[PDB]
Ligand binder design. Structure first.
Ligand SMILES: Nc1ncnc2c1ncn2[C@@H]1O[C@H](COP(=O)(O)OP(=O)(O)O)[C@@H](O)[C@H]1O
Ligand SMILES: Nc1ncnc2c1ncn2[C@@H]1O[C@H](COP(=O)(O)OP(=O)(O)O)[C@@H](O)[C@H]1O
Ligand SMILES: [Ca+2]
Ligand SMILES: [Mg+2]
Ligand SMILES: [Mg+2]
Lengths: 160, 74, 371, 126, 371
């Protein structure tokens, strides 16, 4: 997901040029200029790793939102780093659940966005009102005006 | 009777917690020690009851969460 | 605050807050433990499904009613049913609500005393009161006289009342009711080939009885007609297909009410125990009881019973008296509607058995002035 | 917006919530000790005649009984509450679980090993 | 640590670590000693080639499966197969990994007890658990009800399950499976001139069956069509040339599943033992079992079986019920995927048979609570 987008944003032109040269060397002779789902799967089977074609479709849907089955530079790096899924288990569940439950200081079962605002003021990361709005949209799936506990699980799912 | 059993069980726990307070034969320091034992028991029960209160507040909020999710699960 | 008008019944528990028109939650009173082994892990399988949940998983349960004939035979299961009723079907803690249970006439004392002891110790209600199931059904009709035949699912009882003064020497309680009709229907269905044995299939036979059976106006003529034509054979689709066709079993199942010799019972039918209950009354209130005969309870919902009963009583009674049978369309919940009306009265507000009174006299308080 | 800033927000919120909950728990412990010491009051009556000592002993035995009865009733009630909470948790899970089965993948072996296996002998720098 | 989800099977051993999508190593379970004399010295000739190595040197070996029908008939060979599976195909010592074997229903006890004794004494695992091969296939489908027909290569068994409660009285185990179909195909190929006799050529006939045979939607029409036209004759190249042409042997080999009278077996086909297994269940869960019929196992991979079986059951079943046949594309490894899911559960983590428990009660611990 956008996890790999964050990971590659952590990465720099070193990884960009390294994978560009790897493309120049191994994808040499391919008429694509990118890596296709079928090409990637066949090459993996050639080397020995045999992921499912359903995984190919999933990954292509993820990185290549347009459904072309190719990999644009940013989504290409995202797909390439997607193979190495070192970070799993998504931090802790129950302790973070307690943290989120106490986040509802009003304890009404409703997480006001203003509590999030205060916590972000504590964080102070470079963010505008539209940014936190978009993040809440990514979190407030049912659009109930709060952070739902199930949606709290959803947006922090797999998140370390 | 299961409810008879519960009432009798709580009464028996009460009876067990009642120690033999036959101490007048003892000297002043020993009586002070016994009073300290009772005091420590009371303070420990105070800590236990405080934990009960905070955990019951958490239980109530989590039951609110449960009811909210019940509403969500229509 | 508001009062909880619960009504244990036997077959359907009906409950709801006082002052409404219909019970809030109506669900069968069955508690069924699973009987097979169970191989899926973590499926979240409970140890006992009660109420309406066990009417959906009844394929792998062994349903067993906790109330046999008015009396309660399995106190743990009844406590479980009450706990479910309070907490999940109404979601009101009992610590803040008076309760008004209902009880059949002529029941064992120990049943009533245990009921009040449970309500005061386990659920810890503020105050509870136990009322006879027929007086409420008389409340709901808006009358003040009349002889009410409350043919429930457990027990059929016939309480005559005049001007508000109940006649305790004229109560005729008979133990034939809907459950025996279900068993007899399940027993006569075997004459065509359909065998229902499992305690789960008793529910299917009950559904057949509810949807198809009717009371014949004249029994011999119907028996002759069903044996020549085929205009009566109505079909019904089981929960898996294989439709069945019920012939003259349709009006033979509920005929047991008027001829209890079918299931081997000695006593006379519900058409003659009402007349006997009237004749035990004084000679000057028989006309009013004749004119205000009231029907209630679930089992009196058979299509065509309010005419058969009137014909029978008119045959028995003197020719001059007018026989009228009150059969309101809201028959099933008549007892509960009457219970709501009684609990909503201001004059009744001081008859509750307050908890301090129970603490001073023990569970035997119910037989005392607070009846 | 960018995803890196969103991940930074996520981890910062993790830290903020954890620290606030921890500080709240610390305050709860401190106030617990403070209020309980304010409730359980130390005594000092040494050297006194054993009559007064025994009167205090009986008073405190009764007090122990009262506190035990109250706290044990409260604990029983809280255990009942926790049991009911677990029942509701199981009910809500059964209503909204099932699909809740996670999936684990070991197919995604280390990507450097994949690059090595593909490039074969020429797998020198990648 | 991680658990080893082994699955002995009969014909293909499938193994891999818990929590993945597909088994790591899949290889035939055959152990073949050489049969000729051998003249080259120092060639490094071993005394027994097991697993996939003996499918390449099968020209001079005598392959013999160590598992006949679910049960294990040759314990030394099975021990050799397990040793190979642990050390060479997975390269993980068993001293540091729990194991989850699988076993067909209704198998002899001694087989299971010997299996656990071997796993605890020879390989010395920390803890092992034995599970019925059908419950896993139900796990993999993500259901919790349904009747699963797991037609493996050794034995075909049909376990119905409802709401997680298995019905032990409705398991119908039939011993017709892929191996008997291979033998019958090898027997009907002789009608054209091709004779396969050697135990090595049974593998060639198995390959023919896998690549060419299909299940006919209607048997008589196909028999009539194949006897007039020639649109069905598909050719196949043996391991040395001399292509062969299979005519109406294509759909006659797998037809034995629905008419076990072809190989002389008395019982009814897999289309009628499923209906019988359903009809033994209670009357209220038959609709759910009808709607959630699950297929699994290798032999249910014939092209066109999910339609023939549905047509047959729809013919047998009542006309109102909906018949649906779940045939996931990952049928072959369904049991192992389910095994991985079960081993990955947290609730299951305390059901393993810990070694100290075995030391206290002996191998008969498997029949006890830890099933
Ligand atoms: N519409 C109906 N037609 C015929 N019989 C019915 C009908 N509804 C309910 N019954 C019978 O009445 C019984 C329910 O009676 P009910 O009045 O609920 O008993 P209780 O007095 O215990 O509440 C059922 O068991 C059923 O056999
Ligand atoms: N694609 C296929 N088409 C037809 N039959 C197959 C196919 N794949 C496997 N089989 C049959 O199924 C058998 C393998 O079944 P399998 O599920 O491995 O048995 P087990 O339950 O012992 O693992 C093989 O012997 C073969 O006869
Ligand atoms: Ca909030
Ligand atoms: Mg009633
Ligand atoms: Mg198998």
């Amino acid at each position: 997901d956008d996890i790999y987008k964050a990971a590659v944003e952590q990465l720099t032109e070193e990884q960009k040029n390294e994978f560009k040269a790897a493309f120049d060397i191994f994808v040499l002779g391919a008429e694509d200029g990118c890596i296709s789902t079928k090409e990637l799967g066949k090459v993996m089977r050639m080397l020995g790793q045999n992921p499912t074609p359903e995984e190919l479709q999933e990954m292509i849907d993820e990185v290549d939102e347009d459904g072309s089955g190719t990999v644009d530079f940013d989504e290409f790096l995202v797909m390439m780093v997607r193979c190495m899924k070192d970070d799993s288990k998504g931090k802790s569940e129950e302790e973070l659940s307690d943290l989120f439950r106490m986040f509802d200081k009003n304890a009404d079962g409703y997480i006001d966005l203003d509590e999030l605002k205060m916590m972000l003021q504590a964080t102070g990361e470079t963010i505008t009102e539209d940014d936190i709005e978009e993040l809440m949209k990514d979190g407030d799936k049912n659009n109930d005006g709060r952070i739902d506990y199930d949606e709290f699980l959803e947006f922090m799912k797999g998140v370390e | 009777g299961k409810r008879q059993t519960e009432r009798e069980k709580k009464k028996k726990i009460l009876a067990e917690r009642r120690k033999v307070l036959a101490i007048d034969h003892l000297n002043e320091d020993q009586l002070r020690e016994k009073a300290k034992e009772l005091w420590q028991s009371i303070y420990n029960l105070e800590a236990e009851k405080f934990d009960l209160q905070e955990k019951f507040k958490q239980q109530k909020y989590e039951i609110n969460v449960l009811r909210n999710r019940i509403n969500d699960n229509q | 605050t508001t009062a909880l008008v619960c009504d244990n019944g036997s077959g359907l528990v009906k409950a709801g807050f006082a002052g409404d028109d219909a019970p809030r939650a109506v669900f069968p009173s069955i508690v069924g433990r699973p009987r097979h082994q169970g191989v899926m892990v973590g499926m979240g399988q409970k140890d006992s499904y009660v109420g309406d949940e066990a009417q959906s998983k009844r394929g792998i349960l062994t349903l067993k009613y906790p109330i046999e004939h008015g009396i309660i035979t399995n106190w743990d299961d009844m406590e479980k049913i009450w706990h479910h009723t309070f907490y999940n079907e109404l979601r009101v803690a009992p610590e803040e609500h008076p309760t008004l249970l209902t009880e059949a006439p002529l029941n064992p004392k120990a049943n009533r005393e245990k009921m009040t002891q449970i309500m005061f110790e386990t659920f810890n209600v503020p105050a509870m009161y136990v009322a006879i199931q027929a007086v409420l059904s008389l409340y709901a009709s808006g009358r003040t006289t009349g002889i009410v035949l409350d043919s429930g699912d457990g027990v059929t009882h016939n309480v005559p009342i005049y001007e508000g003064y109940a006649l305790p020497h004229a109560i005729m309680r008979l133990d034939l009711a809907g459950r025996d009709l279900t068993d007899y229907l399940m027993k006569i269905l075997t004459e065509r080939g359909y065998s229902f044995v499992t305690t789960a299939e008793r529910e299917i036979v009950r559904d057949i009885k509810e949807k198809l059976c009717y009371v014949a106006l004249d029994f011999e003529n119907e028996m002759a007609t069903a044996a020549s034509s085929s205009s009566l054979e109505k079909s019904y689709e089981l929960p898996d297909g294989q439709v069945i066709t019920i012939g003259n079993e349709r009006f033979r199942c509920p005929e047991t009410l008027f001829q209890p010799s079918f299931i081997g019972m000695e006593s006379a039918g519900i058409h003659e125990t009402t007349y006997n209950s009237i004749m035990k009354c004084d000679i000057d209130i028989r006309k009013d009881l004749y004119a205000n005969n009231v029907l209630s309870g679930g089992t009196t919902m058979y299509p065509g019973i309010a005419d058969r009963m009137q014909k029978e009583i008119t045959a028995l009674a003197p020719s001059t008296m007018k026989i009228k049978i009150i059969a309101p369309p809201e028959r099933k919940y008549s007892v509960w509607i009457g219970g709501s009306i009684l609990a909503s009265l201001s004059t009744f507000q001081q008859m509750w058995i307050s908890k301090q009174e129970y603490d001073e006299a023990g569970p035997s308080i119910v037989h005392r002035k607070c009846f | 917006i960018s995803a890196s800033r969103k991940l930074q927000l996520k981890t910062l919120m993790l830290q903020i919530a954890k620290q606030e909950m921890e500080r709240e728990a610390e305050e709860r412990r401190g106030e617990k000790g403070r209020v309980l010491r304010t409730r359980c009051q130390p005594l000092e009556l040494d050297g006194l005649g054993f009559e007064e000592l025994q009167d205090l002993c009986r008073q405190l035995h009764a007090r122990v009984d009262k506190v035990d009865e109250e706290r044990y009733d409260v604990e029983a009630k809280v255990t009942k509450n926790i049991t009911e909470i677990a029942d509701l948790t199981q009910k809500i899970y059964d209503l909204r679980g099932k699909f809740k089965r996670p999936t684990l993948r070991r197919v995604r072996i280390s990507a450097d090993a994949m690059m090595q296996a593909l490039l074969g002998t020429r797998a020198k720098e990648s």
